[PDB]
Design a protein around this nucleic acid. Sequence first.
DNA 1: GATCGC
DNA 2: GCGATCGC
Length: 132
Amino acid sequence: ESKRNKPGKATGKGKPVGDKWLDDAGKDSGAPIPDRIADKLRDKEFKSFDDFRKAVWEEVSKDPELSKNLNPSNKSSVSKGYSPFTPKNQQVGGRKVYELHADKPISQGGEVYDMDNIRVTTPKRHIDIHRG
DNA sequence: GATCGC
DNA sequence: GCGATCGC
Ligand SMILES: [Mg+2]
Ligand SMILES: [Mg+2]
């Protein structure tokens, strides 16, 4: 029974970025996690990490700035709290959306709802990070 | 099994 | 609950 199943409260300050944040997502560390987003949710006791994610994208959807750079089809996803798709070259088979990755692995004392520890990646990066 | 998503 | 991918 993993620590991302059982409930917990949101913690973290975030990081400053632009509306062109998802290049770094395919690159190294990844894209950061927005501080507008962080503040919007700091200290909300969430039921599961599935509950948290919905609340992250849904706030991206209510955010006119970060949604600005998504097509009419991804503004939808986030508008119901779903991850938007990545570009095809960044996808791996049937793993197609952006993925919220625990920078420090949870098993090594990485905290689940530690927004400062969450980085955003394309599947192709997410795999490579977990190798190189 | 680990760690991401619906 | 279910589906995906990597696996040294
Ligand atoms: Mg990982
Ligand atoms: Mg298995």
